[PDB]
Amino acid sequence: NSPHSRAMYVYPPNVESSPELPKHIYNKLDKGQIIVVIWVIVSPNNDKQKYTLKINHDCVPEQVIAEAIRKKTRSMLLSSEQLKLCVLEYQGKYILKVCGCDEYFLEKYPLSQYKYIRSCIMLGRMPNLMLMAKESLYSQLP
Amino acid sequence: NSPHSRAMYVYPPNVESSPELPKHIYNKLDKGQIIVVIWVIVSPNNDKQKYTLKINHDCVPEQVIAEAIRKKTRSMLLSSEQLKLCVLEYQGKYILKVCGCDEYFLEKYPLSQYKYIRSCIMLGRMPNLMLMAKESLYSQLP
Ligand SMILES: *CCC(=O)N1CCn2nc(-c3nc(-c4ccc5c(cnn5C)c4)c4ccsc4c3-c3c(F)cc(F)cc3OCCOC)cc2[C@H]1C
Ligand SMILES: *CCC(=O)N1CCn2nc(-c3nc(-c4ccc5c(cnn5C)c4)c4ccsc4c3-c3c(F)cc(F)cc3OCCOC)cc2[C@H]1C
Fold this sequence. Notes:
Ubiquitin-like (UB roll), Phosphatidylinositol 4,5-bisphosphate 3-kinase catalytic subunit alpha isoform (chains A, B), oncoprotein
């Protein structure tokens, strides 16, 4: 089986049955938008950097990856064609997970449909997420 | 004629000539096991939930239903008799099909002998399957 399949089997997504967000949960957001923190390892010294994003609650994990690139590329050092290539490149290179936990967001679902996010919203807690390279995920498989 | 007989005539299986898997295809599996995706409709609003299973390639469709039952009841501390009762009940209530396509797995064949499954194995792709209520299939017959 493909490494993508084995990651799905080992780390199955914890999504809700409906993508429709309950009204009492949606009202806890800022006009349906949720503030999340995105971590990443940027240096060989395992130094971690972070971005604080405000995104729609129904963003899929691949849209979170794209939104984090737009946050960084605000300071322009690349053309538009280079930027589009970088978004597609890193969308196929990185996956999203909960920081410090064995909870992953490998499948295309609205972020708020994942159970970890809903508990974060109901608890008034900020989702603490990490961008991990797909190859680093495939190497830790049994 | 019986409704099950009518379903076989209307939806005949697309199977390969031999149940023996060629070596170059078998070697694409993880020690003879295939990872499949099983969808199901859980709410009257047609909300779908899914399981990602790793099963023997020569499981018959009724064994796929049994493996999905063991997946859900894994934590429930059920006895063998309790588990068997649920397995027999849902084996007589649900059939297996390709999700979103008019391809069915109604007959006792090794799953890998079906042409859709074997091509999935050769592609390194997960079979995208759906569990449909038997009565819903018999109602759509001519
Ligand atoms: C084609 C893609 C490409 O070449 N690049 C250039 C490098 N790059 N880094 C990130 C990225 N950067 C940060 C970040 C924030 C703040 C920082 C530093 C360093 N010093 N400070 C103060 C780095 C970051 C923080 C969280 S996530 C992230 C990313 C980032 C991203 F937004 C989306 C991703 F898919 C991956 C990454 O990180 C990859 C690890 O570093 C290479 C984006 C890029 C892209 C545009
Ligand atoms: C004696 C048998 C019996 O009473 N039950 C109880 C109900 N039941 N549901 C399933 C089943 N559940 C899921 C599933 C997975 C993840 C879920 C939800 C809801 N929320 N989350 C996060 C439901 C499921 C997903 C794919 S297949 C499946 C099944 C399932 C099965 F494994 C085998 C089948 F033959 C049928 C079904 O689903 C039938 C639809 O009813 C919900 C199993 C049972 C059994 C144990």
